[PDB]
Every structure is written in C-alpha cells, then in structure tokens.
C-alpha cells in the first residue's frame, strides 16, 4: 500500500526525510496556532534556556518559527537544532530560539518528518559516485510529492520504495537503471521478485556502460 508523502530533505548518505500528506493540514493548523501564540508571547521577553534533548521553537531562514529539538550547545551564538517536522539541521544563535509551549508539543501532534533509506540499493562508497546518486535524487524528488511503501526494518532507518507521483516509476529502481547505485540483495522470499527486477536493471546498466559502469565492470 503506497501512501502519499512529501519528500523534504535528502542526506549526503542517501537517506531522506518525508512528511505524511494525510497529516499536512494538521501540521499547517498547528503551525498557524503556534505562530499566533508566539506573536503574543515574543521569545525576546520570554527567557527560554536551551539544553540538549530539549524541544524548542527555532526561527528558520524564511523568518518563520518552527518546532525543533536542541542537539548541541556549542556557544551562545551556535546552538545546533534539528527541525522535527522537516528533517533539516541548522546552527543558530539564541536570538532565534524560544520555548515550545505544551500546547504545540509532540504529544499534541507527532514530529512530522520521518527518516528513510531506499530498499534494495547500496549507498555508493566512493565519494564522487555517492554525490552523483544523491544529486540525482535531489533533482528528481526533493520537495515533491511521492508514493511510499515501507519494505523492511533495519539496524538503522526503515527501508522503503518510492514511486514518482505521475509516472508511478520506482525511484530507487531508476537509480539502478542509470547505473548510479548497486543492488543490495536480501534473503526474504517476498523480496525475490523485486530484487530480480533490480538485478536485471543493474545488468542492463552495466551493458549500457552507465555511470558506475562507464568503463566496464
């Protein structure tokens, strides 16, 4: 069952964050109400005190306040935050931090960004190859609605397949077809048909001498 998601951020190690489209209006409503509350209780007159693991509000580069979590306090001028509804990280001064009121907590609405990786593909170990794959994904899916299916859990993030909204083409499989990534095989019998399809695309990418396979194998 492929669910609609909005892809927000692509990491340098080929992970990505998504928002669930089904809860997008709930997030927007929370953000409108939180920002109305911030306007009546300006952080400048509030004296929040940032600490690691503590939630906060953080003012992003669009001049709007968002929900965040403090990850590291380097100095008063350098507080490292993670925007819990988007997945991006930022270093900011204390002038751009405030209290997250309980009315807008993750108990009221869960963190809206979830981190995933692509199922059935290996992240390239070579830096330039990895950059090529990340750049392809950023161009094709960053800040777009896609369809997502969770395939398997791992010792890290869950691994998923993504489809383009329009064509319904499998995004990860596209990378394999382009020779941008290698296939990661698994043993589960329910993945055998899809892994078979990915390996077939990989062999065709090798024959076409694309990207990873430009000079042969």
């Amino acid at each position: 069952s492929y669910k609609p998601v909005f892809v927000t951020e692509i990491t340098d190690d080929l992970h990505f964050y998504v928002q669930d489209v089904e809860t997008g209006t709930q997030l927007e409503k929370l953000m409108e109400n939180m920002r109305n509350d911030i306007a009546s209780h300006p952080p400048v007159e509030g004296s929040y005190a940032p600490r690691r693991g503590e939630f906060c509000i953080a003012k992003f580069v669009d001049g709007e306040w968002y929900r965040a979590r403090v990850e590291k306090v380097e100095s008063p001028a350098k507080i490292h935050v993670f925007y819990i509804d988007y997945g991006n990280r930022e270093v900011l001064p204390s002038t751009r931090l405030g209290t997250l009121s309980p009315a807008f907590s993750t108990r009221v609405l869960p963190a809206q960004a979830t981190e995933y990786a692509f199922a059935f593909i290996q992240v390239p170990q070579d830096d330039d190859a990895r950059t090529d794959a990340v750049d392809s994904v950023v161009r094709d899916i960053q800040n777009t609605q896609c369809l997502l299916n969770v395939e398997h859990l791992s010792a890290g993030c869950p691994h998923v397949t993504l489809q383009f909204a329009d064509s319904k083409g499998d995004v990860g499989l596209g990378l394999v077809k382009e020779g941008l990534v290698m296939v990661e095989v698994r043993k589960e019998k329910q993945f055998q048909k899809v892994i078979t399809e990915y390996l077939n695309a990989q062999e065709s990418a090798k024959s076409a001498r694309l990207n990873l396979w430009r000079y042969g194998d």
């Binding site: 928002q19 669930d20 709930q26 669009d62």
Partner: peptide
C-alpha cells in the same frame, strides 16, 4: 511559503 506537503 516554505515547500511542504499540500494535504
């Protein structure tokens, strides 16, 4: 505004 889901 900021790119985000349009539910």
């Amino acid at each position: 505004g900021r790119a985000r889901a349009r539910a």
